[PDB]
Design a protein around this motif. Structure first.
Motif, PDB file in Angstrom:
ATOM      1  N   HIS A 157       0.828  -1.209   0.000  1.00 14.27           N
ATOM      2  CA  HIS A 157       0.000   0.000   0.000  1.00 14.27           C
ATOM      3  C   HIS A 157       0.867   1.265   0.000  1.00 14.27           C
ATOM      4  O   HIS A 157       1.567   1.547   0.975  1.00 14.27           O
ATOM      5  N   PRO A 158       0.830   2.038  -1.104  1.00 17.42           N
ATOM      6  CA  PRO A 158       1.588   3.282  -1.290  1.00 17.42           C
ATOM      7  C   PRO A 158       0.928   4.489  -0.621  1.00 17.42           C
ATOM      8  O   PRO A 158      -0.285   4.677  -0.728  1.00 17.42           O
ATOM      9  N   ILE A 159       1.732   5.313   0.048  1.00 17.98           N
ATOM     10  CA  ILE A 159       1.224   6.501   0.735  1.00 17.98           C
ATOM     11  C   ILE A 159       2.082   7.738   0.498  1.00 17.98           C
ATOM     12  O   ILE A 159       3.302   7.700   0.663  1.00 17.98           O
ATOM     13  N   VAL A 160       1.442   8.838   0.119  1.00 11.37           N
ATOM     14  CA  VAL A 160       2.167  10.081  -0.097  1.00 11.37           C
ATOM     15  C   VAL A 160       1.894  11.016   1.085  1.00 11.37           C
ATOM     16  O   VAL A 160       0.744  11.363   1.358  1.00 11.37           O
ATOM     17  N   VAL A 161       2.956  11.422   1.773  1.00 13.01           N
ATOM     18  CA  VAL A 161       2.838  12.301   2.934  1.00 13.01           C
ATOM     19  C   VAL A 161       3.384  13.700   2.668  1.00 13.01           C
ATOM     20  O   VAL A 161       4.524  13.849   2.233  1.00 13.01           O
ATOM     21  N   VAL A 162       2.571  14.719   2.936  1.00 14.52           N
ATOM     22  CA  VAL A 162       2.988  16.107   2.719  1.00 14.52           C
ATOM     23  C   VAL A 162       2.588  17.038   3.871  1.00 14.52           C
ATOM     24  O   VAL A 162       1.655  16.747   4.619  1.00 14.52           O
ATOM     25  N   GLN A 178      -2.073  13.564 -10.138  1.00 17.62           N
ATOM     26  CA  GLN A 178      -1.651  13.516 -11.529  1.00 17.62           C
ATOM     27  C   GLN A 178      -0.252  12.924 -11.685  1.00 17.62           C
ATOM     28  O   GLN A 178       0.225  12.741 -12.801  1.00 17.62           O
ATOM     29  N   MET A 179       0.415  12.637 -10.573  1.00 16.64           N
ATOM     30  CA  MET A 179       1.744  12.047 -10.648  1.00 16.64           C
ATOM     31  C   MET A 179       1.766  10.636 -10.031  1.00 16.64           C
ATOM     32  O   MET A 179       2.822   9.998  -9.967  1.00 16.64           O
ATOM     33  N   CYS A 180       0.601  10.151  -9.587  1.00 15.94           N
ATOM     34  CA  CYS A 180       0.476   8.805  -9.004  1.00 15.94           C
ATOM     35  C   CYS A 180      -0.961   8.409  -8.635  1.00 15.94           C
ATOM     36  O   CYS A 180      -1.897   9.190  -8.793  1.00 15.94           O
ATOM     37  N   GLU A 181      -1.129   7.186  -8.144  1.00 17.42           N
ATOM     38  CA  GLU A 181      -2.447   6.696  -7.743  1.00 17.42           C
ATOM     39  C   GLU A 181      -2.513   6.556  -6.211  1.00 17.42           C
ATOM     40  O   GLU A 181      -3.541   6.164  -5.653  1.00 17.42           O
ATOM     41  N   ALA A 182      -1.415   6.899  -5.538  1.00 16.18           N
ATOM     42  CA  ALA A 182      -1.330   6.791  -4.085  1.00 16.18           C
ATOM     43  C   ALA A 182      -2.129   7.851  -3.330  1.00 16.18           C
ATOM     44  O   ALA A 182      -2.251   8.997  -3.772  1.00 16.18           O
ATOM     45  N   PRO A 183      -2.712   7.475  -2.184  1.00 16.21           N
ATOM     46  CA  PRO A 183      -3.477   8.475  -1.435  1.00 16.21           C
ATOM     47  C   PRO A 183      -2.494   9.479  -0.827  1.00 16.21           C
ATOM     48  O   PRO A 183      -1.375   9.115  -0.468  1.00 16.21           O
ATOM     49  N   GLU A 201      -6.455   5.677  10.423  1.00 14.82           N
ATOM     50  CA  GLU A 201      -7.206   5.660   9.171  1.00 14.82           C
ATOM     51  C   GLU A 201      -6.793   6.938   8.449  1.00 14.82           C
ATOM     52  O   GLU A 201      -6.634   7.980   9.078  1.00 14.82           O
ATOM     53  N   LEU A 202      -6.612   6.858   7.138  1.00 15.56           N
ATOM     54  CA  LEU A 202      -6.186   8.007   6.346  1.00 15.56           C
ATOM     55  C   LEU A 202      -7.281   9.057   6.176  1.00 15.56           C
ATOM     56  O   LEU A 202      -7.009  10.223   5.897  1.00 15.56           O
ATOM     57  N   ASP A 203      -8.520   8.624   6.356  1.00 12.73           N
ATOM     58  CA  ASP A 203      -9.700   9.462   6.195  1.00 12.73           C
ATOM     59  C   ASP A 203      -9.616  10.946   6.567  1.00 12.73           C
ATOM     60  O   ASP A 203      -9.796  11.818   5.717  1.00 12.73           O
ATOM     61  N   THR A 204      -9.364  11.238   7.838  1.00 11.08           N
ATOM     62  CA  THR A 204      -9.309  12.623   8.285  1.00 11.08           C
ATOM     63  C   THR A 204      -8.037  13.353   7.868  1.00 11.08           C
ATOM     64  O   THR A 204      -7.912  14.566   8.071  1.00 11.08           O
ATOM     65  N   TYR A 205      -7.100  12.615   7.273  1.00 11.61           N
ATOM     66  CA  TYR A 205      -5.829  13.191   6.832  1.00 11.61           C
ATOM     67  C   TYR A 205      -5.722  13.311   5.301  1.00 11.61           C
ATOM     68  O   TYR A 205      -4.781  13.898   4.790  1.00 11.61           O
ATOM     69  N   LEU A 206      -6.686  12.747   4.579  1.00 13.20           N
ATOM     70  CA  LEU A 206      -6.687  12.790   3.117  1.00 13.20           C
ATOM     71  C   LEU A 206      -6.761  14.196   2.560  1.00 13.20           C
ATOM     72  O   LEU A 206      -7.494  15.044   3.068  1.00 13.20           O
ATOM     73  N   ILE A 207      -6.004  14.429   1.495  1.00 12.32           N
ATOM     74  CA  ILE A 207      -5.967  15.733   0.844  1.00 12.32           C
ATOM     75  C   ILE A 207      -6.630  15.665  -0.536  1.00 12.32           C
ATOM     76  O   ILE A 207      -6.144  14.977  -1.431  1.00 12.32           O
ATOM     77  N   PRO A 208      -7.747  16.380  -0.726  1.00 13.42           N
ATOM     78  CA  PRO A 208      -8.450  16.378  -2.018  1.00 13.42           C
ATOM     79  C   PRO A 208      -7.514  16.626  -3.221  1.00 13.42           C
ATOM     80  O   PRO A 208      -6.822  17.645  -3.272  1.00 13.42           O
ATOM     81  N   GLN A 209      -7.510  15.691  -4.176  1.00  9.02           N
ATOM     82  CA  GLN A 209      -6.667  15.760  -5.381  1.00  9.02           C
ATOM     83  C   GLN A 209      -7.452  15.969  -6.697  1.00  9.02           C
ATOM     84  O   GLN A 209      -8.401  15.237  -6.981  1.00  9.02           O
ATOM     85  N   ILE A 210      -7.027  16.955  -7.499  1.00 11.40           N
ATOM     86  CA  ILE A 210      -7.615  17.297  -8.819  1.00 11.40           C
ATOM     87  C   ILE A 210      -7.471  16.048  -9.728  1.00 11.40           C
ATOM     88  O   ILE A 210      -6.992  15.015  -9.265  1.00 11.40           O
TER      89      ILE A 210
END
Lengths: 211, 12
Positions: A157-162, A178-183, A201-210
């Motif tokens: 499971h891939p994860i992008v953290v910013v 646009q540069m990956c499929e990772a949440p 859970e990633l839910d409350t930490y997810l960042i809306p992606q265009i």
């Protein structure tokens, strides 16, 4: 054996520790390494501390994250007390009695970030990006460095953290999709999970992606 | 609580 690190202590308190480390022959220093066995945290009477880099790394490495009261009280009874009796119980952010330190120690056989692939993408304030990586490593994640680099199969499971506020005051990262499929999740997903030593859970930490 | 120069992460 025994190698100390201190966090939240004034130079003054650092000496009581040095005086304590001297007597008991403990390797006391400023930088937290792999040989460090104890992270001494300034805490309140209830063993709650603030979250510093050392706090996160102490937990991640399954080290003794103990209240500075371990030193003062030992110094008081002229004898080195049990670390377990003074282990940090929680912090000012994730809970006063979450027991994250102790859980990290008792969960070294089952790391929370087990089977996860994480890329700390973007700028980061107050915590060198390399430290944030060592933190996800110690916790069992696999470190990636390149959005388009993640391993493409299904046992991972891939994860992008910013850190959203680590760039500008105009947008530009609701576009990491646009540069990956990772949440993509805020850095808090890691800090919270590590402090509590329970993958969140990633839910409350997810960042809306265009698109 | 923390009285050092060490940064704290209590928010973002």
């Amino acid at each position: 054996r025994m190698s100390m690190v201190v966090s939240g202590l004034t130079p003054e308190e650092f000496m009581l520790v040095y005086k304590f480390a001297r007597k008991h022959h403990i390797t006391l220093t400023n930088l937290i390494t792999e040989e460090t066995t104890h992270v001494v945290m300034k805490t309140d009477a209830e063993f709650v501390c603030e979250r510093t880099l050392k706090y996160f790394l102490g937990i991640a490495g399954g080290k003794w994250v103990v209240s500075y009261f371990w030193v003062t009280q030992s110094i008081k009874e002229r004898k080195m007390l049990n670390e377990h009796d003074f282990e940090v119980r929680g912090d000012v952010v994730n809970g006063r009695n979450h027991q994250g330190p102790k859980r990290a120690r008792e969960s070294q056989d089952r790391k929370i970030f087990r089977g996860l692939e994480i890329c700390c993408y973007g700028p980061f304030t107050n915590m060198p990006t390399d430290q944030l990586e060592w933190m996800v490593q110690l916790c069992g994640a696999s470190v990636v460095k390149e959005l388009s680099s993640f391993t493409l199969g299904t046992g991972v499971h891939p994860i992008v953290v910013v850190q959203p506020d680590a760039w500008t005051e105009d947008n530009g990262f609701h576009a990491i999709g646009q540069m990956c499929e990772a949440p993509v999740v805020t850095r808090e997903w890691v800090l919270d999970s590590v402090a509590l030593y329970q993958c969140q859970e990633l839910d409350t930490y997810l960042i809306p992606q265009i698109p | 609580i923390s009285r050092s120069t060490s940064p704290t992460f209590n928010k973002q």
